[PDB]
Amino acid sequence: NQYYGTGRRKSSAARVFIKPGNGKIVINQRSLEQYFGRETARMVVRQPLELVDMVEKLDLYITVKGGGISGQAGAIRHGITRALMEYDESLRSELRKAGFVTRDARQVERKKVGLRKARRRPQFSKR
Amino acid sequence: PRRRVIGQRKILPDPKFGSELLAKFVNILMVDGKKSTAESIVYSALETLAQRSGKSELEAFEVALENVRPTVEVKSRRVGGSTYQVPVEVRPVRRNALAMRWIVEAARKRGDKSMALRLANELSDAAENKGTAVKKREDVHRMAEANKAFA
Amino acid sequence: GQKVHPNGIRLGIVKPWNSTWFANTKEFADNLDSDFKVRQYLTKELAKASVSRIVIERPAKSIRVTIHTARPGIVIGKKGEDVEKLRKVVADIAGVPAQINIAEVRKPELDAKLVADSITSQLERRVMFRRAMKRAVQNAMRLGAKGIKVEVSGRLGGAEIARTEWYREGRVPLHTLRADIDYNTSEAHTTYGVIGVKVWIFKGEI
Amino acid sequence: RIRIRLKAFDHRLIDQATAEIVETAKRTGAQVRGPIPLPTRKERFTVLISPHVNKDARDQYEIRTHLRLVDIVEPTEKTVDALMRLDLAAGVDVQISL
Amino acid sequence: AKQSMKAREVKRVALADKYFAKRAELKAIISDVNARWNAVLKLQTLPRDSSPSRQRNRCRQTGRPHGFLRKFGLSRIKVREAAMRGEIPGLKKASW
Amino acid sequence: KDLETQSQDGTFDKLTKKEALMRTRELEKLENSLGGIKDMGGLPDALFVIDADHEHIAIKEANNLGIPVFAIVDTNSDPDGVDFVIPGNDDAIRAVTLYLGAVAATVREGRS
RNA sequence: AAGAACCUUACCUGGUCUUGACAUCCACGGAAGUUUUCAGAGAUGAGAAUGUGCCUUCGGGAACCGUGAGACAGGUGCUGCAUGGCUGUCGUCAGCUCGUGUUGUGAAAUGUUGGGUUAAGUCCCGCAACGAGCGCAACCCUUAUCCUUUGUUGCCAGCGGUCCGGCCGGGAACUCAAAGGAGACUGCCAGUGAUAAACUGGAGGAAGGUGGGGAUGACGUCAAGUCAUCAUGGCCCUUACGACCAGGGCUACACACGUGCUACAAUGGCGCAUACAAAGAGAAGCGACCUCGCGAGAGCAAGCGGACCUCAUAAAGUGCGUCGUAGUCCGGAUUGGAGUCUGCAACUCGACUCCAUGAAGUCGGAAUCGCUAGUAAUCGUGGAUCAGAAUGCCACGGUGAAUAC
């Protein structure tokens, strides 16, 4: 069986497809440790799992494309939240109420002619 | 800066403690968008302050925050050419933020080799109102007590 | 100068191109220069035709050259008395075996190019400018034209003071993307300097 | 077999050009995997709008390039032979790989 | 718009292919490290100007060397002059 | 009138609400100020004012153009602009309403 | 200027010529392989044709030159103050006006001024005003939500063959790959509101109050750049105010200024089991087999106008320890010793490796400027020359800081 989840966030999408099994997470056929996961956002991946019960409900295979690390974590969270709603909307009410399904559209703004960056113009010329 | 509103914004906390106060401390301790090393030094400082204080880490943190706490200030307006300021009780959120930034600047006032060691030592000796930022708190208090002559 | 080119933005929305073909970018330049040369050739040899424009279509080792001219008096001739000669000379100068096809256009006064060139002609023919634009606008409006606009700037009737004049009548939603617009600029050669003309037309909103 | 590729810059023109050929082969063919979107080219060409200093004043020009594929698997040779000599795409070239 | 300039450019590009692609080939044949001797150094009768690499390939509309464009072989101002007249398929105003 | 006839046949809602909002909210707003003049197509033969001083605009246009006047005057108005006078009071709204009813009745009878 | 030794080019040095540099009805011919000869920095020179495309009396020439003569200028001078095309200024500023009618002997106001208001002449109420354009609004892309056609030169859950051959039967729950439809319009309620417009919440915030970004820049002020881009207005240089061949100027340099880049360390030079980037260029081009180079790279180098064949390896980090305080293992601005592709060769002069080279600087005169959410900053990629390298310029994916009483 499968749970429907795509998880679009910050140019990152993760195919969260959960099957019965252990709560362990396999990322790129590998675990989080030898994936060298003590980098940034080292604990945020279990925050969505911190409040909900683990038991024997979640075993998923995940691939993540795009972004850095916060992009990866956001993709994981959005995909698992999208896969989570199989248990009716009773969970989704509090999932939204706690901001667990937060999707932010704060993408990059295009570079502008005349400004060397997003909002920085040349230092104002002499009076 | 005259038409906008205030939405009481909030950003990512540390999941271990899960406190908005500690969230704001760690998020203002951030520099140039640095997450791993900044949080590592934060936890190093927290564990070292717990070790040196001996009491519970969170209550020692609260005692330190109470120690650094200032009370009142004024704002410069330049009305009559002399110091003509109405002492306004600063906003509790703004008071908290100013205390945060005074602690951070007191930490910043050194140039020590190791950031973790310097941070731990200074915050630990500032936890019992005998470190670095309490002098700034006393100086701010001295800035008061005299601005009430003009109201 | 601040106003944007009118049909420039229009072309990418609703107005068809002046040519539609494909070639690799290096010989694209040669094709463009051949188009320029055939444009000059056609506008010089057919100076009496007063063609509205010429559209170039390039199939494989061929070209169509559709022509929209106001009057067919010399465009077709006496059942192919001169059209084949023009076809031959065009094929020879362009170096490719070419055919020529003919279409006709209604209401010559509704053409911006024709009215602008006509106005330049009377201004070459020692008449007052005022009557020129007034006659042009009144003739164009009465033919069902919903809105037009003319502009003349430079020397007005021999006066040496700076002159800039415009005149409009009818709807001109110029800053509306879905407005059909016809634009042109022509030139005159009066003895005291060149006289520049400009004109805008509007026909439909959708 | 014998796939057909088109390289055009007009979405409606390429859509009609690929919606004619597919039934041209489907007059007596069968199967066909189906239409595929295919990726597109993108190029932002910038040029100084002013002829005199003031580099800040520029403008952006781009050219599209769409591609369409059909991927017929098992057609009959009659219609694929009849494909040639019936070319009607004017100003746009078709690409076929042997 | 110097017509002597344009004559020089036209004649050099005319001689940029008839006098090239064979002298350079001969050099490359004799440019091998295996013994190259004084023949390559004594075969310098070439003006070294007709070679396309050392040839500007100027714009051929109004003779403005600035803004040489490989895609169109024109200058910026005339690209604006002609493209806005249409007649160049596929070119639409860009935005994103 | 052409706009309302087109609107009973035109597009209901398209993109911003402004283009269709300006179409219908102004209908009855200016329709009340227009009333039924669409049926008039001419020049009036008479006029009426409830207070001559306050609404002297109509009488001024009338005597500029030459329309006879049948107005009601009272103690605070300016009756120099009216020659065919009906003395009365501006407070008696019921009386003037019945007056309008009676004059409408005698007009609708007339000689017909 | 998206660009310099050579052309560019117009400045200099070494040396000569105007029907001209190069285009004509051309006046007669070889019918434009230019062969060998060497001198000479060089438009310096000049010398035999061995080939003979057109033909229906080579009954016309040569489209090139051989002769000085019926295509004509090579312009680097004014004039933007006569100007047409062209761009910047105020300025995404919220205004500029017009037709009917009135007050006023008349120049003119009247509509565009009063209150509520909104990003705004965006609205509403009242009044001798009613209406209408030029503008903002909207008509286009892109992304944030969901849909049907959609699977290859395939991204895989699946049964198994797997060394992790998606090859089978492949499928939708796949981001992805392009055509089209919905989504939001202040819906409907409650409040503040004159019952007007607006301002506060709720099933929506996967998007709520123009969703966020781009193009769209009204009459006009600037005698501004453009007769050197361009057609001339009144004119002009005239053995040409040109033709040329090589070496040289914008890379340099005893002046004040500005923009940009690594610096002031213990997060920088350290090595190791060492992870995820969207998104382009690619045929006077991209070049997977092996080998070594303190190196620029050196040669066999396959496949290719494309999901085929080059840069996905991303740095952002776990721990070993250091300069554990200073000119410091920080900081690497110099002159000569061997090379990578250079045109013919690198000499104000191609840029890159190995050293002798780490001077001044321990966060900064009285300060200004840019910046109210993926934003200021901190890391890493494509394009223009491409005989050749980018501190920059035109576009990208990462980690992300509040002060707006």
Q: For the purposes of burial, counting CB atoms within 10 Å of the CB of A79, is it exposed (0-12), middle (13-18) or buried (19 or more)?
A: buried
Residues with Cβ within 8 Å of residue F66, at least 6 apart in sequence: none
Phi (first) and psi of residue D5, to 5 degrees: -120, 135
Q: Does residue A55 approach strand G to less than 7 Å at its CB?
A: no
Q: Which residue of C has its CA nearest to D59?
A: C4
Q: Does residue C175 approach strand G to less than 7 Å at its CB?
A: yes
Distance of CA D28 to the CA centre of its chain: 23
Q: End-to-end alpha-carbon separation of chain B, Å?
A: 26
Residues with Cβ within 8 Å of residue A58, at least 6 apart in sequence: A18, A23, A49, A80
CA angle (C2, C5, C6) in 5-degree steps: 120
Phi (first) and psi of residue E14, to 5 degrees: -65, -40
| Cα distances (angstroms) measured from residue C181 to each of C7, C141, C172, D30, D62 | 7, 15, 9, 48, 23
Phi (first) and psi of residue C163, to 5 degrees: -130, 125
Domain encompassing residue E60: 1-86
* Closest alpha carbon to C1' of G207, residue: A105
Query: For every residue of A69-92, which 3-state class applies, written as one string?
Result: CHHHHHHHHHHHHHHHCCCHHHHH
The answer to whether D51 contacts chain C (CB < 8 Å) is no
Q: Does residue B5 approach strand G to less than 7 Å at its CB?
A: yes
> Which of C188, C168, C194 minimizes the C-alpha distance to C121?
C188
Please name the residues between 19 and 78 in chain B that touch chain A, using a CB distance below 8 Å: 35-36
Distance of CA F99 to the CA centre of its chain: 17
Cα–Cα distance measured from residue C56 to residue C43, given in angstroms and rounded to the nearest whole number: 14
Nucleotide nearest to D60 (CA to C1'): G215
Which region holds residue C202: left if phi is over 0, alpha if psi is between -120 and 50, else beta?
Answer: beta
Query: Could you tell me the maximum CA-CA distance found in chain A, to the nearest angstrom?
Result: 71
Query: Could you tell me the maximum CA-CA distance found in chain B, to the nearest angstrom?
Result: 53
Interface test with C, best of D52, D67, D93 (most C CBs within 10 A): D93
Q: For the purposes of burial, counting CB atoms within 10 Å of the CB of E41, is it exposed (0-12), middle (13-18) or buried (19 or more)?
A: exposed
C19:E88 CB<8 A: yes
In chain C, which residues fall in CATH 3.30.1140.32? 107-206
Residue with tokens 């949080």: B39
| Cα distances (angstroms) measured from residue D6 to each of A22, B121, C192, C202, D40 | 50, 71, 56, 37, 12
Cα–Cα distance measured from residue F58 to residue B137, given in angstroms and rounded to the nearest whole number: 79
D91:E94 CB<8 A: no
Is E91 a member of any domain? no
Cα–Cα distance measured from residue C129 to residue C164, given in angstroms and rounded to the nearest whole number: 12
Is E56 a member of any domain? yes
> Which of B45, B23, B24, B19 minimizes the C-alpha distance to B107?
B45
Is E27 a member of any domain? yes
> Which of A61, A105, A101 minimizes the C-alpha distance to A82?
A101
Cα–Cα distance measured from residue B31 to residue B19, given in angstroms and rounded to the nearest whole number: 20
Is E51 a member of any domain? yes
Chain D residues touching residue C58 (CB < 8 angstroms): 91
Neighbours of C123 (CB within 10 A): 21
Residue with tokens 């009066």: C190
Nucleotide nearest to D42 (CA to C1'): G280
Phi (first) and psi of residue C125, to 5 degrees: -100, 40
Structure determined via: cryo-EM
* CATH 1.10.260.40 is held by the domain C107-206: no
- Give the H/E segment covering residue D5: strand D4-8
Q: Which residue of E has its CA nearest to D91?
A: E89
Q: How far is the CA of C38 from the C1' of G27 (A)?
A: 34
The structure tokens listed for C57 are 């279509």
The structure tokens listed for C206 are 């959708």
Residue with tokens 């014998």: D2
Cα–Cα distance measured from residue E77 to residue C150, given in angstroms and rounded to the nearest whole number: 26
Nucleotide nearest to D53 (CA to C1'): G225
- Count of structural domains within chain E: 1
Cα–Cα distance measured from residue B108 to residue B110, given in angstroms and rounded to the nearest whole number: 6
| Cα distances (angstroms) measured from residue A66 to each of A28, A30, A104, B148, C94 | 14, 18, 15, 58, 53
Residues with Cβ within 8 Å of residue A41, at least 6 apart in sequence: A69, A70, A72, A73, B35
Distance of CA A106 to the CA centre of its chain: 14
Chain E residues touching residue C17 (CB < 8 angstroms): 86-89
Which CATH number fits the domain C16-106, given the four candidates 3.30.300.20, 3.40.50.300, 3.40.50.150, 3.20.20.70? 3.30.300.20
For residues B44-67, one letter each, b for 16 or more C-beta atoms within 10 angstroms of the residue's C-beta and e for the rest, the string is bbbebbbeebeeeeeebbebbbeb
Q: Are A32 and A25 in contact (CB under 8 A)?
A: yes
Cα–Cα distance measured from residue A70 to residue A43, given in angstroms and rounded to the nearest whole number: 11
Is E44 a member of any domain? yes
The structure tokens listed for C66 are 């559709």
The structure tokens listed for D54 are 């003031």
Interface test with A, best of D49, D55, D56, D58 (most A CBs within 10 A): D56
Is E95 a member of any domain? no
Cα–Cα distance measured from residue A103 to residue A10, given in angstroms and rounded to the nearest whole number: 9
The structure tokens listed for B130 are 């005998």
Is E20 a member of any domain? yes
The structure tokens listed for A63 are 């691939």
The structure tokens listed for B58 are 């969170």
Expressed in Å, this structure's resolution amounts to 4.6
Cα–Cα distance measured from residue F40 to residue F31, given in angstroms and rounded to the nearest whole number: 14
Cα–Cα distance measured from residue A61 to residue A71, given in angstroms and rounded to the nearest whole number: 18
Cα–Cα distance measured from residue C181 to residue C179, given in angstroms and rounded to the nearest whole number: 6
Number of H helices, E strands in chain C: 5, 7
- Give the H/E segment covering residue E4: helix E3-18
Q: For the purposes of burial, counting CB atoms within 10 Å of the CB of A81, is it exposed (0-12), middle (13-18) or buried (19 or more)?
A: buried
For the CA atoms of chain A, what is the radius of gyration? 19
Q: What 3-state class would DSSP assign to C53?
A: strand
Q: Which residues 39-78 of E interface with strand G at a CB distance below 7 A? A: 41, 44, 46-49, 51-56, 62-68, 70, 76-78
D90:C22 CB<8 A: no
Residues with Cβ within 8 Å of residue B99, at least 6 apart in sequence: B65, B68, B69, B70
- Strands of chain F (E only): list them: 71-73, 85-87
Q: Which residues 4-43 of A interface with strand G at a CB distance below 7 A? A: 4-6, 8, 10-13, 15, 17, 19, 28-29, 35-36, 38-41
In chain C, which residues fall in CATH 3.30.300.20? 16-106
DSSP assignment of E21-81 equals: SSHHHHHHHHTSS----HHHHH-TTS-SSS-GGG-----SSS---TT--TTTSS-HHHHHH
DSSP assignment of B31-72 equals: -SS--HHHHHHHHHHHHHHHHHH-S-HHHHHHHHHHHH----
Distance of CA C98 to the CA centre of its chain: 23
Q: How far is the CA of E33 from the C1' of G48 (A)?
A: 40
Strand partners, F86: F72
Distance of CA C71 to the CA centre of its chain: 14
Amino acid at D86: L
Q: For the purposes of burial, counting CB atoms within 10 Å of the CB of A60, is it exposed (0-12), middle (13-18) or buried (19 or more)?
A: buried
Cα–Cα distance measured from residue D82 to residue A53, given in angstroms and rounded to the nearest whole number: 66
Amino acid at F39: D
Q: For the purposes of burial, counting CB atoms within 10 Å of the CB of B89, is it exposed (0-12), middle (13-18) or buried (19 or more)?
A: exposed
Strand ranges across the sheet with C101-104:
C51-55, C66-69, C101-104
> Which of C131, C203, C206, C143 minimizes the C-alpha distance to C167?
C131
Is E92 a member of any domain? no
For the CA atoms of chain F, what is the radius of gyration? 20
Give the alpha-carbon dihedral of C46, C48, C49, C55, to 10 degrees.
Answer: 40
Q: Does residue D85 approach strand G to less than 7 Å at its CB?
A: no
Cα–Cα distance measured from residue E15 to residue C132, given in angstroms and rounded to the nearest whole number: 54
Q: How far is the CA of D97 from the C1' of G308 (A)?
A: 13
The structure tokens listed for D92 are 């746009």
